Structures are given as structure tokens and as C-alpha cells.
Amino acid sequence: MASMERFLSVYDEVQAFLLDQLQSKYEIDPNRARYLRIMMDTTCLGGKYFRGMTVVNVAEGFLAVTQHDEATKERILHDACVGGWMIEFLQAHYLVEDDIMDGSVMRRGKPCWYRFPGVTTQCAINDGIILKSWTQIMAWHYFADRPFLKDLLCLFQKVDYATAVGQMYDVTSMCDSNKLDPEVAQPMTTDFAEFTPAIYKRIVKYKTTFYTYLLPLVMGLFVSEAAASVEMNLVERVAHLIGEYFQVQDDVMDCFTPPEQLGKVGTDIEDAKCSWLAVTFLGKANAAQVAEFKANYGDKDPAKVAVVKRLYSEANLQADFAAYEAEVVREVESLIEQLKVKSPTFAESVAVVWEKTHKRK
Amino acid sequence: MASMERFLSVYDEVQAFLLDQLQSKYEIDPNRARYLRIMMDTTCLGGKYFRGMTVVNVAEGFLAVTQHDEATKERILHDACVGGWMIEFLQAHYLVEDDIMDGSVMRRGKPCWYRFPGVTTQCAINDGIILKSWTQIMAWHYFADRPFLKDLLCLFQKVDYATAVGQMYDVTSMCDSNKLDPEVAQPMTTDFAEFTPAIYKRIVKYKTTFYTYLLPLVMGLFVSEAAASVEMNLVERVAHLIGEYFQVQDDVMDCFTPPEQLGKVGTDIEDAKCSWLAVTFLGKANAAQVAEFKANYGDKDPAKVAVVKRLYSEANLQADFAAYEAEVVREVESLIEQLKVKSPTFAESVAVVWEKTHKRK
Ligand SMILES: CCCCCNCC(P(=O)(O)O)P(=O)(O)O
Ligand SMILES: CCCCCNCC(P(=O)(O)O)P(=O)(O)O
Ligand SMILES: C=C(C)CCOP(=O)(O)OP(=O)(O)O
Ligand SMILES: C=C(C)CCOP(=O)(O)OP(=O)(O)O
Ligand SMILES: [Mg+2]
Ligand SMILES: [Mg+2]
Ligand SMILES: [Mg+2]
Ligand SMILES: [Mg+2]
Numbered sequence A, B: 001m002a003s004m005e006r007f008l009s010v011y012d013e014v015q016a017f018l019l020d021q022l023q024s025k026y027e028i029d030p031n032r033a034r035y036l037r038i039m040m041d042t043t044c045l046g047g048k049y050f051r052g053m054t055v056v057n058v059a060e061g062f063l064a065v066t067q068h069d070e071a072t073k074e075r076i077l078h079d080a081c082v083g084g085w086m087i088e089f090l091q092a093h094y095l096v097e098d099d100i101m102d103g104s105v106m107r108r109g110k111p112c113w114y115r116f117p118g119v120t121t122q123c124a125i126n127d128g129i130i131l132k133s134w135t136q137i138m139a140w141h142y143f144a145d146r147p148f149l150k151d152l153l154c155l156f157q158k159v160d161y162a163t164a165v166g167q168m169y170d171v172t173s174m175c176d177s178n179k180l181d182p183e184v185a186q187p188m189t190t191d192f193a194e195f196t197p198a199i200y201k202r203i204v205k206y207k208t209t210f211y212t213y214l215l216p217l218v219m220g221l222f223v224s225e226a227a228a229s230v231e232m233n234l235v236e237r238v239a240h241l242i243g244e245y246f247q248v249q250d251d252v253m254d255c256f257t258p259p260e261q262l263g264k265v266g267t268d269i270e271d272a273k274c275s276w277l278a279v280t281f282l283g284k285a286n287a288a289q290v291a292e293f294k295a296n297y298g299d300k301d302p303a304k305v306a307v308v309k310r311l312y313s314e315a316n317l318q319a320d321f322a323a324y325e326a327e328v329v330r331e332v333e334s335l336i337e338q339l340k341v342k343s344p345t346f347a348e349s350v351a352v353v354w355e356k357t358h359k360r361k
């Protein structure tokens, strides 16, 4: 698509601004310039650009209904594109650090950054930190004199923190809360009592929905000067509900989509994740199924994973997924109708964002 | 000292604001609240608070010469204290990630955060990320309506990036630039040609001097409304020169101060660091000393480190340290005299910051 090439053109411009800055102001040499350009490319590119492109789509909606000079249109789209790359590079930061943390081997068809032979955990941790700095550099440089600067930086901060908090929920999810203790090595849960829908929705709301839905949609608004025309409590509710659905699809795929299509080898049973499949499982299983789950879940052992998969498969979790899906379709359409009151244009951009999610892979 | 207790009181207030926010807005539970309170305490407290206290000292200087109401004084000091904790928590973020990266075992008399039995690399990486978020949260909450907000956030950003860039220099310093390549495992240098004063000063300028001297001194200014009364090019030059001296002292100690006094076991010879001692060594050694250095430097082997230490010891690097020190005393006093023209009060706060550094441990 032509729009995605134009989006990528803003990325080249941004990469070129960033590296030229490191050469003229940070005394960087060409080899380290090169190593950071490849790190940037490897960690930021290759995905679908769903988050980044959403910013552009929202602003586009507003430009179709709104009087501007051509130059203002170009300005508005170029800001939406910059803003989008801010979110793509934030994501890039969290995925680098997440793959170190989740013990992961592959992503987007390639080895995780830290697993490249010339990188190692050592560099990649700092590379990830650089990725997020570059998001603030981009903001301060391209939005220097935009009336939305401060609001944009405050919202980005808040989204970044929520994400880090979510990550903390996610990584502490196989542990019993009463056992969390920096002094004592964390033993895996044996009861699985915190594997509940309420806990799962919590984990998911923070680790995924702020940065993948709330941030793109609001940034589209921010860069459009369009925030005072939508109901923000509604933007929050629809973002949190679509992104929760998006995570649930993530979780299903980790288990049941072949690595070839997923392009990232699935580690949820091994890692003992609080996934949608394990929670939904424990919500319908009889006593002996539960006991078999407990003897097997959470271990690298290739045969103990089969047992889990077959439990999941025989429990019929596609029935639960269709009830779940059908109920999300109801609330998402309902929120879309409510956004129509104040903002018909934004409602339609949410409808598009919903449509693309609901159809993914 | 009473001032350090008052500084710590602002920390309790800040910790209490942060955790209460996680409970009322982030749906956090008490066990995870507890785990983050201990993580905060363990990673932020225990040091000298040199950086944080410098902010307070600079503002104090300005309050001695400047007409204010009492309430404005209390406001100004409380901001300086908040600002100081911003720098202490930034440092805390970088040291958590640095100890993962440097392979380190101890710090400030205790095991490095990631080595606590209930933490692990997995959590600590994210804990470190949280530490830096908390610095933006503090800024946005306590400096909400201060005329310096934007300047303070832009300077903090810039300092944070410079630090991350420096870290990248530091971690890539045992590698030959022409060999840096994400695809190929990085072999240790065998020529040590990039172990030069110019390279060392570069590494050091970025990884240490921005966040440890430039940021504290400028933040003192920012919170004082006092920036337009100093020459900023001079603040940059004196900060970069004292902090370089501070790193050189760091490097000497890593080698020659007993672990008991250092409270952090020294890993510079093992890690093959571009330290001041190795550069200064290679600047005076004859041909066979150099060759012995090369056969020995950069290996965990307890006897290969002795050989390096004895080379360092027999080469007489205290002669070079005194010439170095004496020359830093000359330029630092010279910059202090130049800061006197526009700002006698700030000059004296630099003189105090210089004095404390020059006398440390
Ligand atoms: C931005 C925080 C990092 C989490 C992003 N998503 C990673 C997902 P992955 O892409 O690893 O499947 P997870 O939640 O780990 O299943
Ligand atoms: C803030 C960037 C992290 C570097 C801070 N200083 C760590 C020093 P350490 O305290 O590890 O001796 P290094 O430079 O590693 O000798
Ligand atoms: C990180 C997660 C949750 C995997 C889902 O795909 P992405 O979120 O990588 O989507 P794109 O980067 O391709 O838009
Ligand atoms: C991190 C380094 C370079 C070690 C020097 O001491 P600190 O910088 O830890 O000083 P304080 O935190 O005690 O002020
Ligand atoms: Mg994860
Ligand atoms: Mg993951
Ligand atoms: Mg997943
Ligand atoms: Mg280091």
C-alpha cells in the first residue's frame, strides 16, 4: 500500500535526522552509527505498523471533514507519521526487553535482537533503552512548537508507565501474590487461584491496551487538534476492550498457530503464562482435568506441553472463544454507536481499527 | 547531617505519592506494592546522594542572595529536593541495568538488585525501566505548573540519551570499531589501539558527566529561575571536567581500593574495560610491558589479573595520577574564576561540588 510506503518515508527521514545528530553532536563514529542503524531497522521495521498507521488513519479522518490549507494537511499527516513512529519505537523498546525477559528465540521471522551473534543480552538491554530515548528526541525535535507538545508528552509518559506496570503484572503472574518477596526465590503457583478472568483482564489492560490502542487513537486526536470533540472516557473504554480482544487472539495463536505463520515460536505453556487459554480452561474443566493441568503446566519438557495442548483441545475452547468474540462485537459496536454522538468521523476510524483487529492473521 | 534527613523526607513523601497512585489508579495489590517499595528503597537509598544534594545546594546558594517570601523558599527547596530525587532515580535505573550488563556481583555493600533471590534478571530489567518512568511521573506531578517544566524535561531527556549513548560507548570499548557488527560475535581487541585518552574521555563524558554533574548543577539553576544568570557553555565545560576526574577516581578505586571500602567488587581488568589505568599504562609502558599486558588483560583468571595489577603498580601510575590531578585542579579553578564574572554565588556552589569530589573516599 502507498500509505505504508509514505509512512516508511517518514521513518527514513527520522532515522537520518537521528544518526546525523549522533555524528555532529554525540561524536559518534561510522561503525557505531552503522550498528545503531541496523539495530533501529531490525527492531522497528518488519511488523505491520498497525499502531503507527492508526495515528495516520485517525488524522486522515479528521482531514476529510475539516477545512485546512494544503500545507497544513501535509504538516498534519507528517506529524501523525512522526507520532506513529514514536509508538512504533516505544513498542520496539518493550519487545527487545520483553524477549530478553520471556526467554524468547524468534520474532517477526528472525531471531530476537539479543540473540544476534554481535549483540548479546549485554548490548540489547542498552539498545532497548536507546529505542525509547529516540522517541523523546523525535517528539522534542519535530513537535518543538506545536500547541499539543505538552499534552502529547504527558499522555506518552502515562502510557509508557502503564505498560511497564503491566509488564510487571505479566512477569509476576505465575507466582502467588503472598509469595512475592525480593529476598526469596519465587516458586511457581501450585493452586493457580490468580488465574482468573479479573486478573487476566488486569494484566492485559496494562501490558497491551494502552500502548497498542489508547495511545495511537489519542495521538491521532492530539495531532489533529481534535481531542475536545470526542468523549475521552469512551475512547478509553473502547481502546481497553479492543486491545484485550487483541491479546486474547495473541494468546490463542501462541498455542495453536504454526511457528511458520506466527513468525515467533510460542512459549506460553513453558513460561506458565496467565494466558486466556489457561484461564478459560480452568473456568470449565472438571476436577481431574484440573489436576492433570497442574501436573503438567509450566515446564519446558516437550511431552508435558502436549498434554496441556490436548487438554485445551479436548475442552473445546473455540466454543468459549466464539461466546467471548460475539460479546466483544456487541460492546465494541455499542461503544462505536456512543462515539457517533459527538464524533461520527472518529467513530468510523474506530470501526476501521476494530475491523482490522477482528480480521488479523 | 540534617539536610540529608530533610532530603530523605522528600523521598518518603514521593514514595508515598507513587505507591498510593499505583493502588488508586493502577489497581495494584499490597504484595506488589510492597515489592516495588523495597525495590525503590534497595535501588535508590544507601548511596551518598551526592547528585540529588547538589541540586539542593545550588538552590540554597541562590536563596542566600535573593529576595523571597518564606513560602517561596520552602517551595524552592522542596522542588530542588524533588528534582534531586529525579536524578537519584535516573541513576538508580542506569545502575540496575548496568549491573546486569557489566556482570556485576555487589554494590553499596549489598548484592546488585538482579541478584536478590526473588528478583532475577527477568524482573530487574523491568524494575529498572519502572525506575526511570517514576522520574517522569514525579516531574509531571510536582512541577505541573512551574514555568521551568518544559526546559527541565528537555534537559532531562537530553541527559538521559547522552548517558545511554555513553553506556553504548562503554560496553563496546573492548571491541575494535571495524569489527562491530550485529551479525558477528564481537572478539576482544588484540591491539588496544582504541585505548587512547581521546576515546577514554569520550566514553567518560557521555556515560558519567552529564547525569552526575551537568544535570544536578543545571537543575539547581532551573528550579531557582537562575539559568539566565550563568554562562552555560562554562557550566558545560566545568561539569564535563569534574565528572571526568570523578570517573578517573572511580577507575583507580576499582583496581586499588579493597572491596570492603569500595562496597562493590571490582571487575575492570576482567571485563577488559577501557579504564584510565589501562590507557595511562599503555601511554608509558615499554615494548615488553605492553606485550605482557596483552597476554593477560581481559580474563576472569585470578592469576592473569595479578599480572595486570603488578604491571600497573610497577609502572608507577600515581605519578601520572598526580600530574593529571594537578592539571584538573588548574582548569577547574580557572573555570570557577570565569563563572565568578556573571555568577559569584554559583561559582561557590561549583567550588563546593569540586571540593567534595576531590576529597571523596
Ligand atoms: C510492550 C510490553 C511488551 C509486551 C508486548 N507483547 C508481547 C507479547 P508476545 O509478542 O511476546 O507474544 P506477550 O504479552 O509476551 O504474549
Ligand atoms: C548511568 C550509566 C551507568 C554507569 C554508571 N557508573 C557505573 C560505574 P560502576 O559504578 O559500575 O563502577 P562504571 O562506569 O561501570 O565503572
Ligand atoms: C507484540 C505483540 C502483542 C504481537 C502482536 O503483533 P504486533 O503487536 O507485533 O503487531 P505489529 O507490530 O505488526 O503491528
Ligand atoms: C556509579 C558510580 C560511577 C560509582 C560512584 O559512586 P556513586 O556515583 O554511586 O555516588 P552516590 O550515588 O553515593 O552519590
Ligand atoms: Mg511478555
Ligand atoms: Mg512475550
Ligand atoms: Mg504472546
Ligand atoms: Mg558500566
Ligand SMILES: [Mg+2]
Binding pocket: B098, B099, B102, B104
Ligand atoms: Mg559498572
Ligand SMILES: [Mg+2]
Binding pocket: B250, B251, B254
Ligand atoms: Mg567503575
Ligand code: NA
Binding pocket: A128, A129, A130, A131, A132, A133
Ligand atoms: Na529510555
Ligand code: NA
Binding pocket: B128, B129, B130, B131, B132, B133
Ligand atoms: Na523507562
